[PDB]
Structures are given as C-alpha cells and as structure tokens.
C-alpha cells in the first residue's frame, strides 16, 4: 500500500457512488464466469452452468454483496488492512482453503466491473490507485497463509 | 481454444469498436503505464507525457494488430506470425507483460461498451487476449 | 514447441531418473508445500507431514504421468487427454500452481543429476515441463 | 525477511560455502540460455548463440560476479534489503531499463544452481529459506521503480 493522498481521495471519492449489493454480484457473478475454475468452492450454490445460471443465482448474489461489504469496510482503514483482514485471512486459510490467487482475479474483475460502471469517469489515474487497493487487499487477505 | 460463441462475441464487441480503435489502443497504453509502471522499462525511448503522440501512434499499430487478429480469427498463428517473430527476436518483452495489457485492455473496452461489455463477452474476450498473447509469445525459446 | 535437441534431452534426463521417479516425485511435493504454502490450500485431506505416504504415493502417480508425457513426448495432448479433462473440470487447481511445482522439479533433479543437468538440459526440461503445464490447463475454459 | 532465526542461519550456513565466483557466473549463464529473451540487455558481451557460447563468455562471467557479489553484501542487511538496494533499485529502474520480472528469473535460476552444487545439502526447509531471500532481495531491487 502506497497510496498518494490525492490516490486515497480519489478512490474514496468514487466509492461514494457505488451501489455495494450490486457491484458485490456482479463481480463474483463475472469471476464465475471469466474464471470457471473458481467455482470450485461454490458447489451447493446450485446451478453456475451458464452466465445467466450464475449471475442470477440468488445464491451468488448474496455472496457477492457479504464479499464486497468486507471490502467496503477495508476501504475505511486503507492504514491497516492486513489488521482489519486478519481473522478472514484465517477463515480462508484455515477453513475455506481458498488459493490467494482467486483473490487477484477477484481483485482484476472488480476493477474491469468498476469500469463497466463509471464509463470516462473510471481515468487511467483512478484506474491506478484502484490497482494498488486491490492488490493490498488481495494482500492482505493472504498474509495468515501458512 | 476459442468456440464459435467465443469468435461471434469477439467479432460483434470488436465490431462496435469500429473506428475507435486506434483511440481505444492509447487508452490501453496509457492505463498500463499508469497502473504497472515497470511496463515503461521497455519503451525508454518513448515520450510518455499525457497526450504523447508516440503512444498515440503505438496505439494505433497494436489496435490494427488486433483488428487482423479478428480478421483472421480461423488463422491467427499465420496472421500474427511476424509480429511472434518481432517479440520473439528484437522486442523480446518478458511474457508476464502481456497479461497487464490485456487486462488494460478490457478495461478500457468496458469503459467505452456497456452495453456490449455482458459477462459472456467479457470472458469471450479475455480469452481472445489471452490466445493473441500466447502466439506472440510462442517463438520465445 | 520443443525441438529435437530438446526431445532428446528430455529422454536422457528422466532416462537417469529411472526407479527413483516416486521418490523424486515425493520430494518435490514435499519442497513445493515447504516453498510455496498456499500451493497446500489444494490438499486439506492430506497429511502433508514429512514422509506421509499419502504424499509419497501422489509422488509416485505424478512421476508416472511425467514418465508417459516423456514416453508420448510427441503427442502430449493426447497421451495426457484425461489428466487436462481431471484437472479442468474436477481439480481446478488454479494455472498459477503449475509454474510452482515445475520450478521444485527442475530443484529436485538438479539436486540428483548433477552431472545431467547442464545449462542445455535445464532449458529442455523447463520447456517440458511449460508444455506439460499448458497441457494440463489447456481445458480450463 | 520474514526469516526465521533457524531459517536464517540455514541461509547463512549454506552461503559459507559459496564460490560466487563460479556460482555468479553459473547463474547469469543459466539465465541467458534458460530464458533467452534476458539477453536483450547483454548485446556488447558478444557471442550468446549458444549455450556454449554463454557459459564460456567471460563478459557473461565477470558480470555474474559482480551480480552475485551485491547479492552476498545484501546476506547481510536481510532486516534491510530495501536500504541495502535502494541506490541498485533506481540504478536498475532510471538508467538500465531493467524490468524486474528479471529479478525473479535469476532468483529462481539462483536456487537451481545452488541445489546444483550442494545435491544433498539443499535439503527443502533449506530451500524454503533461500525462496525467501530471492523473493525479498527481487522485492527490494524493484522497490524505487516509478
Ligand atoms: C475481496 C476479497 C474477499 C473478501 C473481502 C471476502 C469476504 C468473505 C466473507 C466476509 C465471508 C463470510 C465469512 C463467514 O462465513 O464467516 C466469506 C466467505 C467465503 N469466501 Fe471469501 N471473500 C473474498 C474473496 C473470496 C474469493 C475470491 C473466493 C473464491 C474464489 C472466496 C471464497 C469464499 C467462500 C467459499 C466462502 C464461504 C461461503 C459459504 O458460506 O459457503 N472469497 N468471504
Ligand atoms: C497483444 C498484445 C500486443 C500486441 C498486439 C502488440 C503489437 C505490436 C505492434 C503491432 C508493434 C509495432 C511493430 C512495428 O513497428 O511494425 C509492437 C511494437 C512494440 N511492442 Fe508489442 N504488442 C503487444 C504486447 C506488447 C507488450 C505487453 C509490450 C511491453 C509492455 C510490448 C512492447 C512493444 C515495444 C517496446 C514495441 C516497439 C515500439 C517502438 O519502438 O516503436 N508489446 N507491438
Ligand atoms: C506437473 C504437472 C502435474 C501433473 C503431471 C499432475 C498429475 C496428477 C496425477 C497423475 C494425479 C492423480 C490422478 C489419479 O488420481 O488418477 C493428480 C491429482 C491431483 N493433482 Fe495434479 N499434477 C500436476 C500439477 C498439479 C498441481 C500444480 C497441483 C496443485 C498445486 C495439483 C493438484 C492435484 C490434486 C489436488 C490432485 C488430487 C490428489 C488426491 O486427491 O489424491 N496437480 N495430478
Ligand atoms: C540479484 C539481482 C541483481 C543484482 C544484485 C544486480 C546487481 C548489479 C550490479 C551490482 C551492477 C553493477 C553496475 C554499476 O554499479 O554501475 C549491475 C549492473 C547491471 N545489471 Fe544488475 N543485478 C541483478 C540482476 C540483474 C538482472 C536479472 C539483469 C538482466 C537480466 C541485470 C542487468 C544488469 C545490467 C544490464 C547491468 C549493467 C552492466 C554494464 O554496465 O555492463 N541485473 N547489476
């Protein structure tokens, strides 16, 4: 995390805009989908056979939004994020077995998710500190693998 | 492999681009400089200022290189075989760099076609970008 | 694309290998899990303890797959048919984990082959294990 | 690092034995021949048509000594790789043009050589140690790229 006050202004500017419960579905919804091999961890989440299948599943979209809501409260101690990740770096170590790297491409979609949103308001400069929270959140979220 | 689903949503999204192609590949530039800096190891020579015409110009010969990859969409390994040889032999960009462009790319393809942009396209054209790379890269070692 | 030279190589290497591939196969699970731990999150139902035989007997299926790709060098694709099938659509191990295991093989045999692994076989192997990684993920989507 | 003191001493211990003469050379060589396109930034050495031809380039030798010979000074700043290869960082970055994917290429080519030369001795938990180091000292010398 090195993020630029006018970075932090900047992310935290365009997060006042998002709608989490929905970005939160479409986001996992689309890492479904681009990333089939995700859906490893979802199987009692039903029927992911198609993109209509998966990004309706009412299953998915209530994950979706418990996923982006823990990420909306990280935006909120961008200081301290491997502290404020801490116990949920365990769960998914410890209880989930989740790769860290479904937390990069997590990580890519919302991003590309973000700019299917805010259009020419989603700048290459905005772009760029969104690229650093992510990572850092990704980050994060692996620093209680062992 | 690319499925016939896969090159309809890539010609169709590709389609919209029309024009703006050349637009769209600066874009795609300059996003990549911005977000992964080391990227910018490999174009010392280059202005990077906001508005360079230099990258101006760079994206308008990648965004052509991709219109003939759509072209040729059945014979891609043919119809990008210089540029394979170009990266393989002068250019010699590492492999990893290829994966930050594409995702810039997608980026900036949302950003300019929300209604295009679906999921299903979404993963059409990631794995377009990822079958364009993979030829590139393919005469490496 | 791996080249006469490199077939050969290839063929040499794990011809020296012989009836210590389980025990190389072992050994470079065990340096994987140690060196990368995240590459552990794919197996939660093993014991993954020094000298576990269930490591050692996923040791000994994955030098076996290793020694038919070597066997099959020619036609990789085929001979590795229901493995691609297995990991894409049952496994799902993420394409990242691949790199991790090749790397503690090229490790494991450098360790036991001193003489074999010079610089021309190192490059050969490397590709190998690329194409058998490609191979595996080739089904992912 | 994030070395342990046993895990410390594992490297330190290993280290002792190093020839960075040979090992320097042996590892920038491996490099040049493993991942050809690396050469794109040793054209004045000369003759990198083989691997023969590497491997025996003195240019090639003399330079992976004086790689390896930083990397060892920096064995003993491992609470401060970040110091140690600040000025290395932008040297790499501002005049090299040196992209730090490299780094990482050498680091693991590094680890081959040395399991290389010490067979049994480069046992896995000693690995895991020397993993950690490459990944840190590539961390540190890609640390001042802007
Ligand atoms: C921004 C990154 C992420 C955050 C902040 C996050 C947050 C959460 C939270 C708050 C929960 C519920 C915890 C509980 O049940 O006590 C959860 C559960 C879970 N997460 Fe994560 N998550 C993230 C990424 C991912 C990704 C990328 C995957 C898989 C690709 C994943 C897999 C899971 C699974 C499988 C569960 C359990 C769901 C169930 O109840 O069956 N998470 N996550
Ligand atoms: C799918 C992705 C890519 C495409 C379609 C592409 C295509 C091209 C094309 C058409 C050219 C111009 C060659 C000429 O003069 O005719 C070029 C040059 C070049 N590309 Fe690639 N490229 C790709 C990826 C990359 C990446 C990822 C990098 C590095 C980050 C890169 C670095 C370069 C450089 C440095 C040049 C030479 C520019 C100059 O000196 O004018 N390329 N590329
Ligand atoms: C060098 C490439 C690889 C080869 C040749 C390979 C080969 C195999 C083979 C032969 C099997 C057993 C099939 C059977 O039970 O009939 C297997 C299973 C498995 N592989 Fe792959 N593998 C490779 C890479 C990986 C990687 C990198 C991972 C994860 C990091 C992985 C995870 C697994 C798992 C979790 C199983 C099932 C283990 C069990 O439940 O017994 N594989 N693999
Ligand atoms: C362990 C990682 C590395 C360390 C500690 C390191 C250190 C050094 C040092 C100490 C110099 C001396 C130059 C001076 O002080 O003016 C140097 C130069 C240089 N390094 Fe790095 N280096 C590393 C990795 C690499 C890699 C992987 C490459 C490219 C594959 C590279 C390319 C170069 C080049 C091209 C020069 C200039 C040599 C000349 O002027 O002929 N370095 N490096």
Do not use: I
């Given at each position: ?102 937390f990069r491409l997590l990580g890519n979609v ?37 | ?97 290829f994966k930050l462009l594409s995702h810039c ?16 396209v979404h993963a059409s054209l990631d794995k ?14």
């Amino acid at each position: 995390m090195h993020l630029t006050p006018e970075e932090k202004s900047a992310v935290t500017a365009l997060w006042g805009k998002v709608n989490v419960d929905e970005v939160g579905g479409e986001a996992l919804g689309r890492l479904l989908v681009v990333y089939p091999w995700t859906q490893r961890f979802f199987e009692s989440f039903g029927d992911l056979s198609t993109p209509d299948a998966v990004m309706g599943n009412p299953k998915v979209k209530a994950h979706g939004k418990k996923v982006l809501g823990a990420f909306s409260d990280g935006l909120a101690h961008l200081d301290n994020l491997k502290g404020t990740f801490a116990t949920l770096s365990e769960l998914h170590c410890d209880k989930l077995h989740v790769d860290p790297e479904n937390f990069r491409l997590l990580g890519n979609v919302l991003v590309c998710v973000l700019a299917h949103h805010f259009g020419k308001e989603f700048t290459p400069p905005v772009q760029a500190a969104y690229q650093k929270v992510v990572a850092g959140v990704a980050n994060a979220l692996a620093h209680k693998y062992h | 492999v690319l499925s016939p689903a896969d090159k309809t949503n890539v010609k169709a999204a590709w389609g919209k681009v029309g024009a703006h192609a050349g637009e769209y590949g600066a874009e795609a530039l300059e996003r990549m400089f911005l977000s992964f800096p080391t990227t910018k190891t490999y174009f010392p020579h280059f202005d990077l200022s906001h508005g360079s015409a230099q990258v101006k110009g760079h994206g308008k010969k990648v965004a052509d290189a991709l219109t003939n990859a759509v072209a040729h969409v059945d014979d891609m390994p043919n119809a990008l075989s210089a540029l394979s040889d170009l990266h393989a032999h002068k250019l010699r960009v590492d492999p990893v760099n290829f994966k930050l462009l594409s995702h810039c790319l997608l980026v900036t393809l949302a950003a300019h076609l929300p209604a295009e942009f679906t999921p299903a396209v979404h993963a059409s054209l990631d794995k377009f970008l990822a079958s364009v790379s993979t030829v590139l890269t393919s005469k490496y070692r």
